[PDB]
Design a protein around this ligand. Structure first.
Ligand SMILES: CCC1=C(C)/C(=C/C2=NC(=C\c3[nH]c(/C=C4\NC(=O)[C@H](C)[C@H]4CC)c(C)c3CCC(=O)O)/C(CCC(=O)O)=C2C)NC1=O
Ligand SMILES: CCC1=C(C)/C(=C/C2=NC(=C\c3[nH]c(/C=C4\NC(=O)[C@H](C)[C@H]4CC)c(C)c3CCC(=O)O)/C(CCC(=O)O)=C2C)NC1=O
Ligand SMILES: CCC1=C(C)/C(=C/C2=NC(=C\c3[nH]c(/C=C4\NC(=O)[C@H](C)[C@H]4CC)c(C)c3CCC(=O)O)/C(CCC(=O)O)=C2C)NC1=O
Ligand SMILES: CCC1=C(C)/C(=C/C2=NC(=C\c3[nH]c(/C=C4\NC(=O)[C@H](C)[C@H]4CC)c(C)c3CCC(=O)O)/C(CCC(=O)O)=C2C)NC1=O
Ligand SMILES: CCC1=C(C)/C(=C/C2=NC(=C\c3[nH]c(/C=C4\NC(=O)[C@H](C)[C@H]4CC)c(C)c3CCC(=O)O)/C(CCC(=O)O)=C2C)NC1=O
Ligand SMILES: CCC1=C(C)/C(=C/C2=NC(=C\c3[nH]c(/C=C4\NC(=O)[C@H](C)[C@H]4CC)c(C)c3CCC(=O)O)/C(CCC(=O)O)=C2C)NC1=O
Ligand SMILES: CCC1=C(C)/C(=C/C2=NC(=C\c3[nH]c(/C=C4\NC(=O)[C@H](C)[C@H]4CC)c(C)c3CCC(=O)O)/C(CCC(=O)O)=C2C)NC1=O
Ligand SMILES: CCC1=C(C)/C(=C/C2=NC(=C\c3[nH]c(/C=C4\NC(=O)[C@H](C)[C@H]4CC)c(C)c3CCC(=O)O)/C(CCC(=O)O)=C2C)NC1=O
Ligand SMILES: CCC1=C(C)/C(=C/C2=NC(=C\c3[nH]c(/C=C4\NC(=O)[C@H](C)[C@H]4CC)c(C)c3CCC(=O)O)/C(CCC(=O)O)=C2C)NC1=O
Ligand SMILES: CCC1=C(C)/C(=C/C2=NC(=C\c3[nH]c(/C=C4\NC(=O)[C@H](C)[C@H]4CC)c(C)c3CCC(=O)O)/C(CCC(=O)O)=C2C)NC1=O
Ligand SMILES: CCC1=C(C)/C(=C/C2=NC(=C\c3[nH]c(/C=C4\NC(=O)[C@H](C)[C@H]4CC)c(C)c3CCC(=O)O)/C(CCC(=O)O)=C2C)NC1=O
Lengths: 172, 49, 162, 162, 172, 172, 163, 162, 172, 162
């Protein structure tokens, strides 16, 4: 758990020097773009139930063995856990988007998630595809120009896409 | 309400609590006497000596 | 470390819930206050050497016996250590200003401060009055709400010492 | 309740410390947009009956069967009781606007919602539809920041219903 | 615990109504003097050790029997307890000053204090005298026009004073 | 707690003697006619949500006092507490019906309810009325000859009535 | 505070805070069907008060002859009559455990605090095990069918608790 | 799964002593009533299609709107998975009847029922009416004690849905 | 917890003065003769089963109505609790004998025992009689001259008797 | 207070057992160790005022600035109450000697020492080296066996101050 400002702070401490004007300008840019960042994370949190239901529908459409007996999600509580874990990864991705640092998700859970999904025998590529579908459904909602003053947010979409990509790849 | 508790557990915790300021000090003039001696074996009734 | 954003994320994750309006509110307040703190820390960085030299002169004027031989402040090595400690305090004040939280200050200075000051018999009052001197010099080096935030961070460091 | 002020006080008290700069910065942000929040509360209070009645009609429009005789929604008692429920929800949305946090919603509506609904066989979808209608109308009623903050509290309620 | 907003909300709710327009006027005012309130709270917070030390010095100069052997502040243990109680009371006064409502004092600070002090044999007269000395010390730092853009804030001094009197009357 | 066998055994032991042939006959009759007791207990357990729903409906229709704003069952959290209390008490009557003795109820259940509700300020009269409503809404589920072998069970109806009456009279 | 099928199922249902689903009522039906052999065994064992207790005392003496003489526990009218009293207690709580159809009476009334009260008064569990084994042998000829089976089960539970 | 004998081993292994009279007695009673449970499960195993289609048509006739366009009851695949869901409920009731314990039910349907009904917008009223219809047909197909034991696991499934 | 030294110290501190010469003489005499105290404490510790058993024999041979059914020492659980209380009281008497001060007894065994015994219905007169019987059995053991050097220990006999009488008078 | 006798009793008490051989062993060690300690206490008590005067003037000689105007040692009250504090330390060292344990020190002085020294700015070094002066003076005030005990308690006080 750490944010970009504290990454600059920590590297400044490590080199032992005061924060340089270049990184300070970068931090000012991040701080002024934080207005758009707040709307991005707010959209994520607002649309989280719709996003997760959408991605669950698309996943259970594209992948079917999670329905059949002997499939991982066939027992009822197991696919309840499917939905719960999808919600958890979305919550952590919203955290990362607000912070601007990918480690708040990775170092927090992806270390143990790899071994957990290896031991449990679940198709982990299915979880990576779930992350990808989560990313797509969130991307659909983040481009909602209604309800919000129009601006430039391509960098925020790229940030969300890369965060979800890294989450899935660590899962994968 | 905690699953399985008796009706009395609430009253007994109220007797133990003594407020947010209070404490389980033992520096009192009394010396940390027991509060629930008779509320546990005579949960309902009251007796005078 | 700890900023407004970090405390937001921590409190939101502790209850196991999404990132609702209250912590978005704290984040927006910190985000708006960002720029003045940025300028304040920039101004402080412009005045590293002046501030640290003035602070050690202040401790010497308020603690004259320190300079005598056989004391802690005798010897040019301890003079450079004066400068280094004051510079460390100032640098972590600027780090707190940039991060807009007491986080860097806490976990770099305040974390385990009493134990270290007791081990080498450093006096907290030395650093307290030196921070008062830095307060006095930033009262003129700076302007605006930058004053109130910088002085709050310096006062937090002082209160940690005291 | 969980305001900004109250949550700050609780988190500082649990650690047994005073309010440092992060807490006061969050409180400053809260006080700073108290004005858009109070203005949204004033609008949603003034346009009370229109919002409630339109929401009820939207619930019936999307749920035809509910008005049909011999079951839940039929009867002027259930009609007035629906109006009372929607008045409750809007009341607590304006309470949350005033209190710059989800204190009142979470305390009154959100906590204990689902057990009581399942006990009375009330459908969450009805209330979700009423709040979607209120979202649509308060989009028109409010512009700028008040719009966004209101919408935050409405969809917080909607999510809790979902 | 209630701030002023939550208190007004509860009052409105018991009447089963929305918030009236006079109430919203008052709360808009309270949020408009929120910055002055923040300065008062920060002056209480920054000057906390100085206030505690000043109050302790004057209290033990006044009431010398507290520190004679057999007095109820004699060893280091119960002297540290004195200083701890005073710091806690200033903490809760600053909490209530930020909130604008004295509900935190009754809820937490003064919930059982009379009972604790009667059980311990602590002289509640002396504790109330400590709180009053603390009020006198605090107002000096509150009324300090240094480092804050000048203005009228006598309302805040009255509020802080009545918080100190509330605590002192609850104890004594 | 005590069923009827344990109770008769305790009364025998206090007199310090074996069980009389008369009490042996009583317990033999109880065991022979405990199948009907199993049926009655099942009738309460399967139909518990219906009983609580009916009792709540008639109680809050009879008393707008509880559900009006400022009332004791209003805020939608005290409401869940109300329904939970009804659940608990009906559960304990089902226990004391299977056992055969009110010891389960008045020991594990209702020593402290009067003063618990007095400490919370809730009306105990309304709780007794709720329990009476539960009784009335339960007997109708308890007499149903649908999908249960026909027979005479008036003793069990009197038993359930006296358990509900004991709970109501203690809480009141 | 005793234990029975009824009491165990009520307590376990209470601990999770739920109603009694099928399993508890099933077990209760088992108990209620069982209570005929158990109760009539308790009746047959109550009718044989004196023969059982006297035979058990005499069997304790026969297997532990050295107890009867002066200088040992079993000397004197009081000690022997109170041996009769103790064996009566054991048999009585055995019939209580039959009627209750559970070891709750034996446990609560005899088995809890058994070992300490045997040490602090110097009572040998072998004396009681021999008396219990005699009672067991004679229930072998009083009771037939499952009644004998459960009388023997409770006598064996008491003997295990002594050993 | 927590079957009666599974309860026996579970409640035994926690504490020191072996399986006393009470546990043997409970296992005994389960071993008698198992064989009638087996024949009841067999009788319930002959009538999959009749039970499922009768329940489907009952829930459709009680709720005319789900059939109508724009509602989630509309569809070929939707009705096919309606049938698959009711078959699932039937097979898990069969499993419970065979095991003489609610273990299979609690494991396979009831665990996580609420959350999935939440996320996929299913309404428990449909399944509860389906289970009531299955109760009705078990009333005719099964008689006496077998009917009682079947109905007990069934209305346990009802108690789980409610 | 206290002993003789800490009691004298506490008195002197509450007064505020160093320990006077006479009190130092008293504590020096105590420490000098404490070897006899160690022998007495050992006599209590090593024979404790004999004391408990003889006291139990006498108590239940004079007060039959305890061991009768309905008597309050009837089953093995109550008889075991009786013997356990006897042993615990004897234990705290040996403690207080070693310490030379009855504070450990009055704080761990006696500060809530009369109330507990009343709330349990146990006749505190019989408990005091049991304590006196233990005193008699113990005095038979503290005066034993076997395995120890001859000497006078009338002071220790009086002290132990007063500890047993304190237990008796604070239970009865 | 924590002594040898009391610690023995508390250890044999928390375990719910009588006092076995090791406990009486430690008790005997205490009882015969008492006499040197009692003599040390008599000597320190007899030579109390001289020791306090010596320790006060040692504080002033080693810390010469402290008596200069404007700070702690200036003025008659602070000297008289320096004497009071040294008298307290000496009294509790003798108390701990008589009790042959560090009970009285750890209760009336050591417990709560850092907080009250911090809150009054009392430098511990004043007390550390006053105790060092008393530590030295017992070398020519006591000798033999009791000197080790007196030095041991002066030593524990010095370590706790540091
Ligand atoms: C709070 C952070 C956190 C995460 C992220 C997490 C993952 C996680 N998911 C689990 C169960 C599961 N997770 C899934 C979900 C997967 N299976 C497939 O169907 C889907 C493609 C996919 C959905 C995203 C399933 C089916 C299970 C059930 C496995 C079992 O119970 O044996 C488990 C095993 C124990 C448990 O937590 O219930 C873990 C550790 N655990 C955590 O504490
Ligand atoms: C109550 C909680 C809270 C939020 C949510 C918040 C964000 C926020 N967004 C704003 C406008 C804005 N909002 C956005 C973001 C949107 N613009 C679109 O183009 C994107 C699709 C979309 C990104 C999700 C942008 C770009 C601005 C204008 C800022 C700029 O100049 O770039 C504003 C200023 C209002 C104005 O410009 O008139 C705020 C305060 N602040 C808060 O205190
Ligand atoms: C703190 C805020 C709060 C909420 C939210 C609340 C919900 C609520 N609604 C209720 C009644 C009800 N509510 C409804 C639902 C409405 N009627 C229909 O016309 C509409 C379709 C629908 C709304 C969209 C119905 C039908 C009832 C009566 C149900 C019955 O009597 O069984 C009740 C039971 C009290 C009574 O019997 O009057 C509660 C507790 N109560 C509260 O104190
Ligand atoms: C809500 C926050 C809060 C408060 C307010 C509070 C008060 C408080 N003060 C205490 C002790 C004390 N409090 C005092 C305070 C006064 N005595 C007077 O002479 C002076 C005015 C001053 C001396 C410093 C003292 C002397 C003690 C020590 C009593 C003792 O240990 O015997 C104790 C517990 C005693 C123990 O440790 O066993 C409490 C609970 N505690 C809390 O958690
Ligand atoms: C980081 C935490 C934080 C703090 C501390 C803060 C304080 C703060 N004080 C302000 C001014 C002010 N502050 C005060 C209060 C002071 N005036 C004196 O006379 C009194 C002794 C004293 C009251 C106790 C006053 C009177 C003003 C002038 C503006 C006004 O009256 O509202 C302002 C508005 C900017 C300005 O007009 O200069 C802020 C934001 N804001 C923050 O975000
Ligand atoms: C195991 C036996 C047991 C019982 C029976 C029991 C009852 C019980 N009900 C409680 C709350 C409550 N119970 C009620 C219900 C009452 N209010 C209205 O008058 C209704 C008519 C009436 C229901 C019949 C309410 C409103 C509360 C909350 C009170 C409050 O928060 O102010 C509480 C306090 C804990 C909490 O707040 O959740 C207890 C202890 N507790 C137990 O341990
Ligand atoms: C697994 C849980 C379980 C249950 C619930 C159970 C009930 C049960 N009820 C039975 C008959 C019976 N059930 C009843 C009870 C009825 N008397 C009135 O009509 C009322 C409608 C109702 C009670 C108020 C009666 C009277 C009999 C016949 C016994 C007789 O009269 O001789 C029987 C005997 C054979 C049969 O007809 O099934 C059983 C085993 N057994 C179990 O193992
Ligand atoms: C709950 C059921 C229960 C049991 C089992 C029980 C046993 C019991 N046996 C006792 C003593 C005794 N028990 C015996 C038994 C011996 N007598 C000899 O004839 C035989 C060889 C042998 C018996 C097999 C004797 C001799 C004593 C007296 C020991 C003594 O006090 O010196 C005592 C102490 C009371 C007294 O001495 O009067 C108890 C409580 N008490 C109970 O309340
Ligand atoms: C472990 C046992 C199990 C249960 C209990 C279960 C319930 C269940 N039913 C589902 C689909 C569904 N089920 C229904 C059926 C209902 N809606 C209609 O109104 C009918 C009246 C009613 C039938 C009684 C429908 C319409 C859907 C469509 C939702 C979707 O697209 O998945 C889904 C979504 C995933 C899927 O099956 O494809 C679940 C989890 N699933 C399970 O694996
Ligand atoms: C490991 C535990 C431990 C034990 C057991 C112990 C016993 C012990 N008893 C002693 C003497 C003694 N013991 C006794 C006690 C006896 N004389 C009285 O007449 C009674 C018969 C009886 C006590 C009521 C007496 C009176 C002395 C001589 C007193 C003295 O030492 O000055 C001595 C010193 C040898 C001597 O001076 O003769 C020891 C070491 N010391 C220990 O550290
Ligand atoms: C239980 C034993 C105990 C101790 C140890 C103790 C220390 C103690 N010293 C104090 C004051 C003080 N103590 C000193 C000591 C200094 N004076 C000289 O200058 C020297 C340099 C130096 C002594 C070596 C001084 C100057 C003060 C006054 C400082 C102030 O008022 O803030 C105080 C504050 C209360 C008061 O005296 O008014 C305490 C509690 N108090 C106790 O009850």
């Amino acid at each position: 758990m750490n944010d970009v400002f504290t990454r600059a702070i920590a590297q400044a401490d490590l080199k032992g020097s005061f924060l340089l004007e270049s990184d300070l300008d970068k931090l000012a840019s991040f701080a002024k773009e934080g207005v758009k960042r707040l709307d991005a994370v707010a959209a994520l949190t607002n649309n989280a139930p719709a996003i997760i239901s959408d991605a669950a529908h698309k996943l259970f459409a594209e992948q079917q063995e999670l329905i059949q007996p002997g499939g991982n999600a066939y027992p009822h509580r197991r696919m309840a856990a499917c939905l719960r874990d999808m919600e958890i990864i979305l919550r952590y991705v919203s955290y990362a988007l607000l912070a601007g640092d990918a480690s708040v998700l990775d170092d927090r859970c992806l270390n143990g998630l790899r071994e957990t999904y290896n031991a449990l025998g679940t198709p982990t590529q299915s979880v990576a595809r779930a992350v990808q579908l989560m990313k797509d459904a969130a991307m659909v909602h983040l481009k909602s120009t209604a309800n919000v003053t129009v601006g430039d947010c391509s960098s925020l979409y790229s940030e969300a896409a890369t965060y979800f990509d890294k989450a899935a790849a660590s899962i994968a | 309400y905690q699953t399985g508790q008796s009706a009395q557990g609430f009253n007994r915790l109220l007797d133990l609590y003594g407020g947010w300021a209070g404490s389980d000090t033992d520096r009192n003039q009394s010396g940390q006497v027991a509060r629930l001696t008779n509320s546990l074996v005579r949960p309902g009734q009251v007796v005078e000596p | 470390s700890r900023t407004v954003i970090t405390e937001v994320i921590a409190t939101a994750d502790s209850q196991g819930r999404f990132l609702n309006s209250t912590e978005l509110q704290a984040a927006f307040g910190r985000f708006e206050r960002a720029v003045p703190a940025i300028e304040a820390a920039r101004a402080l960085t412009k005045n590293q050497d002046a501030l640290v030299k003035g602070a050690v002169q202040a401790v010497f004027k308020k603690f004259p016996y320190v300079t005598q031989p056989g004391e802690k402040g005798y010897g040019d090595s301890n003079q450079a250590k004066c400068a280094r400690d004051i510079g460390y305090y100032l640098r972590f004040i600027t780090y707190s200003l940039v991060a807009s939280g007491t986080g860097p200050l806490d976990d770099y200075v305040i974390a385990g401060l009493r134990e270290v000051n007791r081990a080498f018999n450093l006096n907290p009052l030395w650093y307290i009055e030196a921070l008062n001197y830095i307060k006095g010099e930033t009262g003129k080096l700076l302007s605006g709400q930058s004053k109130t935030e910088a002085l709050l961070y310096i006062d937090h460091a002082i209160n940690a010492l005291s």
